[PDB]
Amino acid sequence: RKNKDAVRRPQADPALLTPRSPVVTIMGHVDHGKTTLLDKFRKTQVAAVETGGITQHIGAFLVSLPSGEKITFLDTPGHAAFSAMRARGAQVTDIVVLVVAADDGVMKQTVESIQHAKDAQVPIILAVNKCDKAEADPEKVKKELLAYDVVCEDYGGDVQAVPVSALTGDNLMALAEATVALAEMLELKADPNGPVEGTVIESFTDKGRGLVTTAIIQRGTLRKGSVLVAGKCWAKVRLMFDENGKTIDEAYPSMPVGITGWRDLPSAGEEILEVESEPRAREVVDWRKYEQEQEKGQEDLKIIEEKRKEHKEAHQKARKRERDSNVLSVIIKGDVDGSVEAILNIIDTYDASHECELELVHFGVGDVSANDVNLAETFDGVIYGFNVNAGNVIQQSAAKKGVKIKLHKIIYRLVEDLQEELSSRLPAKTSWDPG
Amino acid sequence: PKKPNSANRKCCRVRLSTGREAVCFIPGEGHTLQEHQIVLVEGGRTQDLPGVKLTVVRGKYDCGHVQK
Amino acid sequence: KAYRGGHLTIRLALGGCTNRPFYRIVAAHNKCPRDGRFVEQLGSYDPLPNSHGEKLVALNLDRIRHWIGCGAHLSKPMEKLLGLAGFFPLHPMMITNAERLRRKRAREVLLASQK
RNA sequence: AUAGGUUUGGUCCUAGCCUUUCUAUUAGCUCUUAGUAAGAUUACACAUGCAAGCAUCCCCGUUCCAGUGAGUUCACCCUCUAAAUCACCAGAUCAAAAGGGACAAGCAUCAAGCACGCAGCAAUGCAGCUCAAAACGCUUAGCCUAGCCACACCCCCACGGGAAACAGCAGUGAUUAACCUUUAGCAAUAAACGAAAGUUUAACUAAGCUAUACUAACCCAGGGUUGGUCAAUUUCGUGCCAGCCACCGCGGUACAC
RNA sequence: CCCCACUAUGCUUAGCCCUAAACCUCAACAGUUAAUCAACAAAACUGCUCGCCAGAACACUACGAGCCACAGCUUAAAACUCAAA
RNA sequence: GAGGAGACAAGUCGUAACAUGGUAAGUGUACUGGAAAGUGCACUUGGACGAACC
Numbered sequence A: 001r002k003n004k005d006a007v008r009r010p011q012a013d014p015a016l017l018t019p020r021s022p023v024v025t026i027m028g029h030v031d032h033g034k035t036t037l038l039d040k041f042r043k044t045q046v047a048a049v050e051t052g053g054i055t056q057h058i059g060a061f062l063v064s065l066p067s068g069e070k071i072t073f074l075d076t077p078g079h080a081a082f083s084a085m086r087a088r089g090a091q092v093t094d095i096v097v098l099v100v101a102a103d104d105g106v107m108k109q110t111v112e113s114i115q116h117a118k119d120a121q122v123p124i125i126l127a128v129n130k131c132d133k134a135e136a137d138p139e140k141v142k143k144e145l146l147a148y149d150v151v152c153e154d155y156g157g158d159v160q161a162v163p164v165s166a167l168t169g170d171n172l173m174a175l176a177e178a179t180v181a182l183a184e185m186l187e188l189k190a191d192p193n194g195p196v197e198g199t200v201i202e203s204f205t206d207k208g209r210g211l212v213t214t215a216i217i218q219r220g221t222l223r224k225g226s227v228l229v230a231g232k233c234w235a236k237v238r239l240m241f242d243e244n245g246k247t248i249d250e251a252y253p254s255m256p257v258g259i260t261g262w263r264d265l266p267s268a269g270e271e272i273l274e275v276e277s278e279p280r281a282r283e284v285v286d287w288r289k290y291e292q293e294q295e296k297g298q299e300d301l302k303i304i305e306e307k308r309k310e311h312k313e314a315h316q317k318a319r320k321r322e323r324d325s326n327v328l329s330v331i332i333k334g335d336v337d338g339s340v341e342a343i344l345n346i347i348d349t350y351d352a353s354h355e356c357e358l359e360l361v362h363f364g365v366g367d368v369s370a371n372d373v374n375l376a377e378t379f380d381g382v383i384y385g386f387n388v389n390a391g392n393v394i395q396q397s398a399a400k401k402g403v404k405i406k407l408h409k410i411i412y413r414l415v416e417d418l419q420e421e422l423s424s425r426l427p428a429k430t431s432w433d434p435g
Numbered sequence B: 001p002k003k004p005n006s007a008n009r010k011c012c013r014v015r016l017s018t019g020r021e022a023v024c025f026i027p028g029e030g031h032t033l034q035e036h037q038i039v040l041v042e043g044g045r046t047q048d049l050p051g052v053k054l055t056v057v058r059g060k061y062d063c064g065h066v067q068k
Numbered sequence C: 001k002a003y004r005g006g007h008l009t010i011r012l013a014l015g016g017c018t019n020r021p022f023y024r025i026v027a028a029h030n031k032c033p034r035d036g037r038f039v040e041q042l043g044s045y046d047p048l049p050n051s052h053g054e055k056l057v058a059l060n061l062d063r064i065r066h067w068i069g070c071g072a073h074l075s076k077p078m079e080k081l082l083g084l085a086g087f088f089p090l091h092p093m094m095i096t097n098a099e100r101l102r103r104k105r106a107r108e109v110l111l112a113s114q115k
Numbered sequence D: 001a002u003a004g005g006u007u008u009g010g011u012c013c014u015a016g017c018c019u020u021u022c023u024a025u026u027a028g029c030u031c032u033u034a035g036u037a038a039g040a041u042u043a044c045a046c047a048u049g050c051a052a053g054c055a056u057c058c059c060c061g062u063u064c065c066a067g068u069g070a071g072u073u074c075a076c077c078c079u080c081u082a083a084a085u086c087a088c089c090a091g092a093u094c095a096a097a098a099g100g101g102a103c104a105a106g107c108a109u110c111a112a113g114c115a116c117g118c119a120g121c122a123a124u125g126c127a128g129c130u131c132a133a134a135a136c137g138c139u140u141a142g143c144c145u146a147g148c149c150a151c152a153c154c155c156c157c158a159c160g161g162g163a164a165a166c167a168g169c170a171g172u173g174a175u176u177a178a179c180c181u182u183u184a185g186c187a188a189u190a191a192a193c194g195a196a197a198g199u200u201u202a203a204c205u206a207a208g209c210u211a212u213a214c215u216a217a218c219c220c221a222g223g224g225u226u227g228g229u230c231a232a233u234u235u236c237g238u239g240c241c242a243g244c245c246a247c248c249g250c251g252g253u254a255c256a257c
Numbered sequence E: 001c002c003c004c005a006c007u008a009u010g011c012u013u014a015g016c017c018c019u020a021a022a023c024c025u026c027a028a029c030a031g032u033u034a035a036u037c038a039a040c041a042a043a044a045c046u047g048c049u050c051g052c053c054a055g056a057a058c059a060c061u062a063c064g065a066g067c068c069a070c071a072g073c074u075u076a077a078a079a080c081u082c083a084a085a
Numbered sequence F: 001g002a003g004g005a006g007a008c009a010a011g012u013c014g015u016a017a018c019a020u021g022g023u024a025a026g027u028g029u030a031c032u033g034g035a036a037a038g039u040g041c042a043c044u045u046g047g048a049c050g051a052a053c054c
């Protein structure tokens, strides 16, 4: 089979290059004011309007500074669970604003964000927040960051440290000035023409718009009718929209745009590349699926050869089961692929296999559906929904079929419920811990 | 299989979409179907297996082709 | 279908295939679909010239007269076709479109001459 | 059917199953081009955009077209006669309601229905009516296709209630093996309106996607099969194991894997 | 299975039960022997009418229905299975 | 809950049927019994009685 894949275009020529707005990802530790800082910059108050006051979604916003420049802020979840989301944000970011609470100093997720920033090789700007409250010690914060290699200017370190108070909106002007200065120094540019290149930041299924993916353009302009391919999925761009939902004619580099029309839902963080036409896009998708199938086939050949050698050794020499009580079968349903992946990572961290197995019957994005209920009935399982809805008909059917649907709106609440179920299945409290 | 044939034919138990449970034969030399996996099933009885009248279609969903 | 109101009309039902228009003159109840039921088919009209450069038109003149007597209306294209055939006076819009074409041709001739 | 394979130690007969033929859907593998035709699995739920105006005001239209097949012997002939057109009229055309006749499949392990008739002006009287030549009943199905019948989210209906309705076009969630564009235009035909030039129309026209089909082509060909029915296997590996078969069957050192 | 004893029962009366290899496994009526006929059996047919049958087994079964029947009789399926019977 | 059927399949107890199958076989019906089955009453040949006298 000839290689028909679609490959990211080679680096554009300096003549083609053109100035582009910067992408800044706000990363930090739980409840250290990332979303509050973002709210201050956006002039909108969303921190109050949240479920559990926790950012559980890597959200993009195209803020316009008073100077007239434009910055794409990616506000990332701060909880320990969303490591994949934080890593993807670090990957797509041009600059990383590490928000550290002066009161609490460095933390585990702060170190994780610094490590991701180093891995992505992205300049880091420190925002020491909560400076108003007593014991606020930006000097201590800088001294401790010295350990993790984030050296401030005062100590002859390239990283710029800015004391701010997102609650009181003080010094944010200087933070924005520093962001603009760092963007200028980086001199970010990209080709605004040719086939589009972008990255998927989120994916979900909307009952009115179909398979919708929030992406960030990286090269070229996206327009209605362009044929996109990302991972194993492809789209004919049907509707581009913004954070507000206003249809936008074009998507210039470093703009966050929600794209509709995906024939299949791509995975978060995958690369979107434009192709010539629908037949070419389908060819690319088929080739990629075939490559994945070949990899899986090699692995399956290894396993099957193990089994067949066992059987041959056995033979040449001569010449349904009831599921145990200690097996929790779970369906996972998420509002976005990011949430689904976070829950799956939490599950994969499982280590209490001996006392009770945790089988993942099926996972998906969208409201708990009849097929999910059927899987749960078939495997005497439990459906866990993360910020998804369970219609009245589905509730009636689940009650009839004996399935348990447990919707949740907070990741740690869902994890507490899951550990509760594991303990219940135990013959006591479970020994597996999420962190 | 029933006499005079001798073999250990590979089969699985599936909850078909219609709500019935049935035994599906797994063609091809070797496979990997584990529990919880989705397969497509066609008709056509396996001649030497009594009571088995469904063949798992290769190359669809979770049942990859036979490996050369 | 119990059609509330309506009346007969002699009109051109469109058939043929894509890019190949062809018309069946049908005395059909006006409310019925264009290509749907019809009381009687009164002829045909091939809008595309044949090899002889002709636009064949068949008119079952006797039946057309019968249906006009019975009270069938006439669609504007059918009125124009009958006017061309001479069965009816030339349609006022046929005459006026000819005049408009003449005026436009005169304007374009003047523009071409002024070169 | 021009038939063929298969019961047995063997033959004849009877019989079932299967093969060969032709379509359509789905799947697997594979695919270059142009013209044309056709296109959700579902009467489950729907974001978004559009789909009905015209016009010197009143009127007229939005009851049409387009859609689906949930329901289902309201569809066909005759009688009678509404509405509508024939500038007013005329009977003519068209065609409701009403009456008469006809009108799907399976089950009789659905055999009885329970007032299902008649006379009289009425009063009231008679005790009858349908049915093994299939009544009554249950299940299934749109049909008899220039098209026709039915439905229009459900409660047959729709005052009212449940509730907030794409079974109009494009599109989407769910669901299924089943999965097309959130295109342009009123240039043509049709409809609505106007006295008219004209205006509106997701009807329709012209385009978009799709090997689902037909036609045509390219100096870039795959799929299946190769024991018999049935066209066509060399050498290896395996050795009643791995596996194959539409039927008969093959594999214990293979023209069947 | 052979021997001995004995009871229901075999008999009568009056009611039930309604089954048989209830088979001459060959329906009733009329007619023919003419040009034959898978095999066996009790030669082969023509006209007419009624009854019944449509692979095997499930099955003189299940459910429903009727019956003086109560471990019953009549009517009588389907699922699963096979390539035979 | 349990039964029935069919299939797969080996053992187990017997040998009920197929030859006069070693008590001829079977139908209906009744009693009895580890289990095919035994016997009773009537019925069929889908058994024979060898086919002159002997």
Ligand SMILES: Nc1nc2c(ncn2[C@@H]2O[C@H](COP(=O)(O)OP(=O)(O)OP(=O)(O)O)[C@@H](O)[C@H]2O)c(=O)[nH]1
Residues within 6 Å of the ligand: A028, A029, A030, A031, A032, A033, A034, A035, A036, A037, A047, A053, A054, A055, A056, A076, A077, A078, A079, A129, A130, A131, A132, A133, A164, A165, A166, A167, A168
């Ligand atoms: N003392 C103090 N509290 C602040 C300041 N800015 C924000 N906060 C509060 O700190 C808390 C955490 O802010 P959030 O933005 O919700 O937290 P976060 O750091 O983004 O964390 P995630 O929920 O993981 O996204 C909230 O109660 C804020 O209102 C500040 O300058 N000082």
Ligand SMILES: [Mg+2]
Residues within 6 Å of the ligand: A031, A032, A033, A034, A035, A036, A053, A054, A055
């Ligand atoms: Mg926060």
Ligand SMILES: [Mg+2]
Residues within 6 Å of the ligand: none
């Ligand atoms: Mg195909």
Ligand SMILES: [Mg+2]
Residues within 6 Å of the ligand: none
């Ligand atoms: Mg129906």
Ligand SMILES: [Mg+2]
Residues within 6 Å of the ligand: D109, E063, E064
């Ligand atoms: Mg019954």
Ligand SMILES: [Mg+2]
Residues within 6 Å of the ligand: none
């Ligand atoms: Mg209604």
Ligand SMILES: [Mg+2]
Residues within 6 Å of the ligand: none
């Ligand atoms: Mg609807």
Ligand SMILES: [Mg+2]
Residues within 6 Å of the ligand: D166
């Ligand atoms: Mg639609």
Ligand SMILES: [Mg+2]
Residues within 6 Å of the ligand: none
């Ligand atoms: Mg969909």
Ligand SMILES: [Mg+2]
Residues within 6 Å of the ligand: D178
């Ligand atoms: Mg299709």
Ligand SMILES: [Mg+2]
Residues within 6 Å of the ligand: none
């Ligand atoms: Mg060999």
Ligand SMILES: [Mg+2]
Residues within 6 Å of the ligand: E060
């Ligand atoms: Mg009996």
Ligand SMILES: [Mg+2]
Residues within 6 Å of the ligand: none
């Ligand atoms: Mg009985």
Ligand SMILES: [Mg+2]
Residues within 6 Å of the ligand: none
């Ligand atoms: Mg009974």
Ligand SMILES: [Mg+2]
Residues within 6 Å of the ligand: F015, F016, F021
């Ligand atoms: Mg014996």
Ligand SMILES: [Mg+2]
Residues within 6 Å of the ligand: F023, F024
């Ligand atoms: Mg005997």
